[PDB]
Amino acid sequence: TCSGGRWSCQEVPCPGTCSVLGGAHFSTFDGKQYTVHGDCSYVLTKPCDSSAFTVLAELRRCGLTDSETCLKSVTLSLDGAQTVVVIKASGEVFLNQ
């Protein structure tokens, strides 16, 4: 809000957004951006002190060179791996295998 020629600002609840684009470009919840071409399954997000949820990404080299990475699957694990959903790049969804 404007007052006396200056802006007075109040914080409001604000959801965060992480993004994995192109199989190699990562943008974290805090806005940090980087680019690593992985060849494994990696832990995207997870509580440190618990295992209520866990998101994994299967970033694999999909070309002749080592810098062509594809996101082949995304794994959502819930309640200590008691509910595992694997979504593949082909659109197939596997609930509990």
Partner 1 sequence: NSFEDPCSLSVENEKYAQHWCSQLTDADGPFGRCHAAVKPGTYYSNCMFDTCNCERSEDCLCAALSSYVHACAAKGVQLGGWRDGVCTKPMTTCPKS
Partner 2 sequence: GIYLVVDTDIGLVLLWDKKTSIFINLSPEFKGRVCGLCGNFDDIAVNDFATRSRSVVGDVLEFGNSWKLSPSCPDALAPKDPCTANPFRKSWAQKQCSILHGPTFAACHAHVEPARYYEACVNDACACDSGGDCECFCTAVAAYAQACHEVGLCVSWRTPSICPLFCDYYNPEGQCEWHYQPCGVPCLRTCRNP
Partner 3 sequence: MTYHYHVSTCQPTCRSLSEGDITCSVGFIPVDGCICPKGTFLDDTGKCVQASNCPCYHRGSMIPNGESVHDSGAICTCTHGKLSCIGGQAPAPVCAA
* Residue placing its CB nearer to partner 2 in the complex, 14 or 48: 14
Radius of gyration of the chain (CA): 18
Q: Is 17 in the site for partner 2 (CB under 8 A)?
A: no
Count of residues near partner 2 by CB under 8 A: 7
- Non-local (6+) Cβ contacts of 91 within 8 A are none
Q: Is 1 in the site for partner 1 (CB under 8 A)?
A: no
* Residue placing its CB nearer to partner 2 in the complex, 30 or 66: 30
Contacting partner 1 within 14-33 (CB under 8 A): 17, 19, 21-22, 25, 27, 33
